[PDB]
Amino acid sequence: IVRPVADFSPSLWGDQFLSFSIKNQVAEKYAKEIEALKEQTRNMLLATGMKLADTLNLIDTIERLGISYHFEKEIDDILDQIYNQNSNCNDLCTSALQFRLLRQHGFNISPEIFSKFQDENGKFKESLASDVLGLLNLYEASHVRTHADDILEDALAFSTIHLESAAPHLKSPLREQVTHALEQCLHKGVPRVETRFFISSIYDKEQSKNNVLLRFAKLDFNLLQMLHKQELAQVSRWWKDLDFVTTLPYARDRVVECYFWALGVYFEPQYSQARVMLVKTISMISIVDDTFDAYGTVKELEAYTDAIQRWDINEIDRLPDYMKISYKAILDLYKDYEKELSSAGRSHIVCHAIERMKEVVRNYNVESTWFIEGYTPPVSEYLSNALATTTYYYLATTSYLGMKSATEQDFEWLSKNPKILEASVIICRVIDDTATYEVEKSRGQIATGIECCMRDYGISTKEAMAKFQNMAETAWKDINEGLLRPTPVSTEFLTPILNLARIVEVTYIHNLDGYTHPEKVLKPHIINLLVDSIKI
């Protein structure tokens, strides 16, 4: 009979993104200067006879400035040289940076590089507590551990306590860099978010800074931002022409946040078509989610689920009027993808994303059934269903659609649920369940994962959320390990999965629902990435 009642916030943004006209003259000006600065930077990278520590800081600086996607060949060659030369005689600062940069790029450098900084007990020499730059680089490095790196077991706690201790008396911008590192490490942050912070709050205020790199980074950031705003304008126009804001009023209106997620998966210009496909899907499955999660009677969701499995416009008449709206929108979206990909003969690959979406919808229907029955499964059984309901198997598959170079063999690998994809999915699940345990346990929801975890192990909500946190930490060890050479597929198809995990950490930072309540977390990120340019 009657439905639930509306609890969701409206879009924060109105139509402020709907229209954006690129100032073409400015665009060409920026692009023209960048080409000159690009070659100056390349020559910095090819300069012969640099010290190890200077070469690492140059690579680090360029990566954090968001301009390393211009120099993948150069940076790879350099790190390849460093990996295969074994220079072990350096201080903590250089050693920890060396370790991090090589691991992030898939070079399996031994964690024994850290032996010289530990005593016979394997715990870090406390005499290092006053090397702030060394601690900072150790702190960052401690976040790329795999399961083989238990020698670094103490690195995070050791560096954290002493960085906290030093911070209030540090000079700027080092103090700000440390304070922000402690809030958000580099490895698990969204790359555009960290780049924007680094460029304007840190590097712009360093006395040592290289002016060519700073100017390069500002111009390149503001130039990509113009492309992002164009993309968001086109997606805003598509979303508005759908008009789910009035015809499907029960669902979250978050296409801007969805674009932010797509931007986190990749920011580079060559992934423009990919981002636009990805965001359309994210916002569309967000609708489907809210239909099971907050409007769908058990019967109604059954008709919807079967309709999705058969995947055929003939099925719309078995559905309620309001479900006809979302269902045809879904079917039309995939005919769109097919035509958009028809050009490059990449049309066939769409059925991979479709099959993964059928799978999501099947488990929405299960977990709905669990809530109406009030079933609290064992945690193993709960995860066996709740992993796919993250949508991360599905967004990961989708993310490949627009990538011009994704082949069938790539989708084939992704379909076998590889360990890197599984870890990213696990991180999303357990963090979502912690961040939104109350948000959901408001509406009498007893199907929550935490509740399963409490019932299963006979432990409190304390130990529950803890035990979930650990699964996230184990999963990060598996992501880091999935990045190491020889990689199963090209790094290009691993980075989107890594970035999915990063987006989880960033959106649900400090254990809050950042997607449903964007005001706290996501609004600042969106303003910094898509509203305000960097003051040049």
Q: Does 432 bind Mg ion (CB under 5 A)?
A: yes
CB of 129 to Mg ion, least distance (A): 41
Retrieve residue 221's tokens: 């950031």
CB of 290 to Mg ion, least distance (A): 7
- Among all residues, which ones are annotated catalytic? 252, 261, 389-391, 429, 432, 508, 513, 515
Q: Does 338 bind Mg ion (CB under 5 A)?
A: no
Q: Which is nearer to Mg ion, 293 or 481 (CB)?
A: 293
Specify the stretch interacting with Mg ion by CB under 5 A; choose among 89-97, 100-108, 233-241, 292-300: 292-300
Specify the stretch interacting with Mg ion by CB under 5 A; choose among 27-35, 189-197, 202-210, 435-443: 435-443
Phi, psi torsion values for 256, nearest 5 degrees:
-70, -45
CB of 449 to Mg ion, least distance (A): 8
- CB atoms under 10 Å from CB of 33, counted, come to 15
Helices 321-342 and 272-294 pack at an angle, to 10 degrees, of 160
Phi, psi torsion values for 118, nearest 5 degrees:
-125, 155
Q: Does 220 bind Mg ion (CB under 5 A)?
A: no
CB of 302 to Mg ion, least distance (A): 16
Please give the helix or strand (H or E) that residue 35 lies within, else none. Answer: helix 24-46
Residue 228, classed as helix, strand or coil, is helix
- In order, the DSSP letters of 310-373 are H--GGGGGGS-HHHHHHHHHHHHHHHHHHHHHHTTT-GGGHHHHHHHHHHHHHHHHHHHHHHHH
Q: Which is nearer to Mg ion, 235 or 428 (CB)?
A: 428
Q: Does 194 bind Mg ion (CB under 5 A)?
A: no
Q: b or e along 368-388 (b: 16 or more beta carbons within 10 Å of the residue's beta carbon)?
A: bbbbeeeebbebeebbebbbb
Question: What span, in angstroms and rounded, lies between the C-alpha atoms of 11 and 260?
Answer: 14
Specify the stretch interacting with Mg ion by CB under 5 A; choose among 119-127, 209-217, 345-353, 434-442: 434-442
Residue 147, classed as helix, strand or coil, is coil
Specify the stretch interacting with Mg ion by CB under 5 A; choose among 127-135, 287-295, 327-335, 491-499: 287-295
Q: Does 293 bind Mg ion (CB under 5 A)?
A: yes
Q: Which is nearer to Mg ion, 400 or 515 (CB)?
A: 515
CB of 389 to Mg ion, least distance (A): 6
CB of 385 to Mg ion, least distance (A): 11
Residues linked to residue 118 through DSSP beta bridges, in sequence order: 124
Specify the stretch interacting with Mg ion by CB under 5 A; choose among 131-139, 278-286, 430-438, 455-463: 430-438
Exactly one of 104, 195, 436, 507 binds Mg ion (CB under 5 A); that residue is 436
Q: Which is nearer to Mg ion, 109 or 388 (CB)?
A: 388
Helices 419-435 and 449-457 pack at an angle, to 10 degrees, of 90
Which amino acids are annotated as binding site for Mg(2+), given as ranges? 289, 293, 432-433, 436, 440
Q: Determine if the peptide bond prior to 524 is cis (ω within 30°).
A: no
Q: Is 80 exposed, middle or buried (0-12, 13-18, 19+ CB in 10 A)?
A: middle
Exactly one of 76, 153, 204, 289 binds Mg ion (CB under 5 A); that residue is 289
Q: Which is nearer to Mg ion, 283 or 436 (CB)?
A: 436
Q: Which is nearer to Mg ion, 410 or 513 (CB)?
A: 513
Q: How far is CA 149 from the centre of its chain?
A: 24
Contacts with Mg ion, 399-418, as mask; x by CB under 5 A: --------------------
Residues contributing to the site for Mg ion (CB under 5 A): 289, 293, 432, 436
